[PDB]
Sequence to fold (561 residues):
Amino acid sequence: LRTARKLRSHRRDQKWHDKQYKKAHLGTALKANPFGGASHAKGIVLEKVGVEAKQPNSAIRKCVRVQLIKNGKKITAFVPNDGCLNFIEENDEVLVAGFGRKGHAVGDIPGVRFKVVKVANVSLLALYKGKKER
Amino acid sequence: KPHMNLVVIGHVDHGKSTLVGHLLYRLGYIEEKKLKELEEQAKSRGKESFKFAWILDKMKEERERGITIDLTFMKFETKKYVFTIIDAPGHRDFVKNMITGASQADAAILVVSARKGEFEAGMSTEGQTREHLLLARTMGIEQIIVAVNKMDAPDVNYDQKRYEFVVSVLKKFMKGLGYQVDKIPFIPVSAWKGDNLIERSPNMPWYNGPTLVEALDQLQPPAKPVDKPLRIPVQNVYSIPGAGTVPVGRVETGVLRVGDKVVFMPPGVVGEVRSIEMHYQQLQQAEPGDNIGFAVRGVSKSDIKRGDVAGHLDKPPTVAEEFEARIFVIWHPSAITVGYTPVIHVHTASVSSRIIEIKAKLDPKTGQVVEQNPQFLKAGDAAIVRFKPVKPLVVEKFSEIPQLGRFAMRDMNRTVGIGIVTDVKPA
RNA sequence: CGCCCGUCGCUACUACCGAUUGGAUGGUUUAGUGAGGCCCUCGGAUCGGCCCCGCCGGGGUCGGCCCACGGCCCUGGCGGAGCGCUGAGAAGACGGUCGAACUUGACUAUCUAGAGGAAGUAAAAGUCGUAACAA
RNA sequence: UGGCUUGUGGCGGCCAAGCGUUCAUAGCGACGUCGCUUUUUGAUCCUUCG
RNA sequence: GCGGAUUUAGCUCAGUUGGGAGAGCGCCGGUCUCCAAAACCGGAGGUCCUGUGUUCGAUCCACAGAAUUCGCACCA
RNA sequence: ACAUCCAAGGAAGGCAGCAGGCGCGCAAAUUACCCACUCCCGACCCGG
RNA sequence: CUGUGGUAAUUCUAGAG
RNA sequence: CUGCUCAGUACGAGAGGAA
RNA sequence: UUUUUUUUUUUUUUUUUUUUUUUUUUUU
Ligand SMILES: *C(=O)[C@@H](N)Cc1ccccc1
Fold:
């Protein structure tokens, strides 16, 4: 009963072995991405580049490199809807957000951790269906 | 006391800004200490003779070059009227600015140099006495006073023969434009000396007409169409500490009050009036003729620009998917066909527009069709044509709101044609 | 006719190394300098009261028919007006502790530029050899 | 060092087929030919090792 | 607002001094195959971004627009 | 250390108090009405 | 607190009762 | 050599810019 | 008392892109 401190100290230190716990523990989340841990960042379409799918899946994926506002850093982004390219023009303000928990992109996608959802401060769904905007 | 908008027009260097500045001065609207400082600054930069002009010309490039570049607005008050006076540039590069000025005007002072060669140049084929007169007519200015300027100049020296020469030339041309020439004052002045600006000049005994101020009082105020729907073409948009983003422009039709919700077309952005100002005096309402700045809550400066038009939400300004017009061709070096794309200067806007069809050539005097779908038009022709603006443009039918329904066509920096819109297909 | 390995040639992205004694940033600071208030040795623009003398006005007593007059006590006005003594009292000023800020460097914490060098990872297949799985 | 000579170097020159959009010379000139030059370099052995 | 660049084939770029364009991918097409890869044929493909001026003639020059870029100005 | 207007001489300021502008960003309002309530502050009222 | 004052200008402020 | 007036002038369609 | 047993590799590196298809009670 008098050896409480060792178990107390032991737990916290052995705990370091949990990588997600570790992630919160080290100021890394703030600095591991262009966002700074942020869910959404406004950006500019520097170029639009077609890319090739990975493994047996064969496809041309719509990809945009984006210059961020406060951050000012290069970003690799994924264009989502079918003919969004028709509606994506260079240097139009774009809001970007991530896919399924931070880390790995959709298995089909190559090196993109980010998704494009707004064009000119307008959501994607509106351009995509005829009834909304044009 | 009724309010009027005055545009000052005419060829480069003919004396527009010197007239306005000097007029404001001897009318005591300008601090003598400031005139003193301007003069010293003008002399020290090698430009003594710009002291009155520099009351209006404030931009770094205006002062460096000694020319006006864009509009300046000044309030002054005569015996009968309060005027907003608008100083417009003569330089050919900035006739687009002069045109927005004319679109906002009730009357015009045409300033024309009597100096040898200066007159002839202004009235030459590619001169801006010629061009500004033409554009003022098309933007719907009927009341005009002409200041035959620089009578003091040594190569002029108050000569009545020179004066009557410029008057007659000016008269023959102005009558060909449709001006009622018998009614318009031709005052011999010196913008620089002051002759005939506000008091009568001993140097020119032979002149019996009004002085310029007297001529102003003899003008007549225009119809105030307060029962037509609100339309305010924006001439510029400022971003102002305390107010936020404030469009400026002249109320053409309708009325605007603090509290109002307003929409700006063609963007489709909506805001709400926090405040209204004319010549630094805060207002609660503004009616046609009011030249104003209006602060707008909920609108970013980047959303709105010059040539956009503000109306109330229930009757928003019309955006033309396409539009139809009656046009006359002033000048063209070859021919105009379907597909021709000059810029359209309408109210404060200027947007290239493609001629998608030429429905009919008309006899310029009678208006009868002389040929269905002509193969082309040329200089001298009149026509009914269809127009598709290259980017979203606001226009109204001339029959409905004439101040958003008259236009010039310009291309390669020349005025090519003039027009009135006879029909609009809304976006 | 199964799996499978590594160097070598493209293309991209990370991180390691790095001539510039490298640049940038923010915290604690050694030393040399020191505004400014404040305590404190002074000073002393200035102001008033009593000191002495002479002259008149007024109240109360004494020597005079007086009246002026003289003495005491209390005020008013003028000269030696400040000439003798006292009190509070602005500028300034001795020497201080406090201590901004300047410079000169330190030092951490936090990023970062670069010819080149060196891995990897996307990695499907081009090119060399058979290492591992069945002694 | 100096020196003859000037191939080599440097510079002008007659002629004008060409450039120069029309045209040769405004401004330039193939080829071909006449030369001036002695701060390059070259060949020569004349002056200087007493 | 002003001023510079840039716009040429499906893609990316070269030309030019007004007589009218040229290459690397592409890629695309066919044969073989489940489909490609390889192999073997075959493909030619452009209002030279637009209007006007000049000109006998404008991809080119001049003057004017658009779109993208980059300087600079303005500052309710 | 910021930084506002300079009659060229000077004079100011500390909105991390309401409103309101900008900025910053992924991220938070309006230049309103009032002492009636709750209290509090000044002296024997009833001011603020 | 009366009145009398100066300055581009500031919470400037004299002298007199 | 530079400045002030000469002068934003004449000459220019402007860009510009003198003596 | 009853058993070995020699032989030994003389010669076998490599094989371009892509590969594929699955789901249930209740009796008439
Ligand atoms: C804001 O000042 C307007 N109301 C007046 C104005 C100033 C500058 C430019 C345009 C308008």
Summary: Residues B 236, 238, 246, 248, 277, 293 surround phenylalanine (CB under 6 Å). The first strand of chain B starts at residue 3 and ends at 9. The first helix of chain B runs from residue 16 to 26.
